[PDB]
């Protein structure tokens, strides 16, 4: 149960988000849709308390900032340096970095989870490759594997299906269905309006305020899309 209460995010004397208030129930795969640059991506960052915000967000009657261990954030692969010297195996192991104490290190339990996460997304033989030596789809699957090892109850992805091949997209979606089957909640910021009823069981339309939110068939409608992409001036 994700619960947002009057969340707002300013930037340059301009509210990019204005009084966001939702109750998201799982298990679910929900799509956050709307115009590019219009607050759908910053909603995830406002929830986590990464950027400054003017409200509260909760996970099962506990504040989101005080319970970050229960949630995993898969950022856009566009703001990761591909030429950083790091292997696929090491990149996936970054998910377990909060779990280890200050003077301890990764035991066999942690490496077994790293091996299994790579095997799920189909990149076990790529474990020793540099991240620079991978396609967009393959690198996205490394980030999904890195997400899996956290063993979180909530998974927030920022445009996971943007600029990837179909084979990679098919694998990534099978992994998110596993997260839904396991009772967990998956909240995807989607990059366009492609395959909305195929991926998502609820949708959340965002231009600045939440213009619509609910079950996909009911809320992914021409009326709601018009005022989102038309800025209530269609």
């Amino acid at each position, epitope marked *: 149960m994700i619960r947002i209460e009057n969340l707002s995010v300013s930037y340059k004397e301009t509210l990019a988000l204005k009084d966001i208030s939702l109750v998201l129930h799982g298990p679910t795969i929900t799509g956050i849709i709307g115009p590019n640059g219009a607050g759908k991506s910053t909603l995830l960052k406002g929830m986590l308390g990464i950027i400054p915000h003017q409200g509260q967000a909760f996970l099962d009657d506990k504040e989101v900032k005080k319970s970050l261990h229960r949630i995993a954030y898969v950022e856009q692969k566009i703001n990761i340096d591909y030429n950083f010297p790091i292997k696929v195996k090491e990149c996936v192991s970054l998910g377990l970095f909060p779990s280890i104490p200050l003077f301890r290190s990764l035991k066999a339990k942690h490496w077994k989870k790293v*091996q*299994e*996460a790579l095997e*799920i997304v189909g990149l*076990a033989d790529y474990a020793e490759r540099q991240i620079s030596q991978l396609s967009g789809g393959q690198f996205q699957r490394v980030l999904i594997a890195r997400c899996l090892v956290q*063993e979180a109850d909530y998974i927030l992805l920022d445009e996971p299906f943007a600029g990837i091949d179909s084979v990679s997209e098919e694998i990534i979606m099978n992994t998110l269905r596993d997260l839904k089957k396991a009772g967990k909640t998956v909240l995807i910021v989607h990059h366009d309006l492609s395959k909305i009823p195929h991926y998502f069981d609820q949708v959340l339309l965002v231009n600045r305020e939440v213009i619509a939110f609910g079950p996909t068939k009911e809320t992914f409608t021409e009326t709601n899309l018009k005022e989102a992409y038309g800025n209530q001036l269609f």
Partner: antibody
Amino acid sequence: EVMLVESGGGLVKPGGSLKLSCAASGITFSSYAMSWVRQTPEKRLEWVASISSGGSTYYPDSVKGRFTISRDNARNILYLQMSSLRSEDTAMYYCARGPMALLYYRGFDYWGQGTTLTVSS
Amino acid sequence: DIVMTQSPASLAVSLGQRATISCKASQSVDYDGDSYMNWYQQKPGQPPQLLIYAASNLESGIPARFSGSGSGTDFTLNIHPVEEEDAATYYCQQSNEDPWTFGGGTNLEIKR
């Protein structure tokens, strides 16, 4: 719908061999740990074999030596070869997405409909 | 082996009331703060259906009326409120050590 379907069950005399198959739809077996679990006529669930994604198989001592679990990646079929079948092997044999260390896959979360095996003369 | 015995083996509960099923184990089912304990439901005809995995993690499709708890060797499966559709046999199971073992069985009768 994600679905597993077993086949190849039937009658075998004591000492005979039989090979069970498991077809998939929506799952690629190579990516997950896969297992076979049996249910006796007295409703006792017993695990009989598993195969990890890497290829490492492992079995219980009660079934070791006789049963061997394999997997065809290209056709995407999981098999269970049985040999020298004893009378205690009479059971409903299930195909299931087996146990793993990661939180979400710690149980048998998918189960096929089940193909039955009788071992009698 | 890790042997596990459920208690009780047969149970009768009326509608809207608490059902409770135990699963004691010979050895630890948890490993280093990670539970590998799992609960299943089996209605006749169909296979066993994963109900709850680890200690308390609820699989989707199963309503929140079901719940799991406990640690180490002692574990519990609660159902409240109990409804007509919950008539089935219930198994515990561990994925911590070889062989992967199941419980004996617990039949749930709904009163009428």
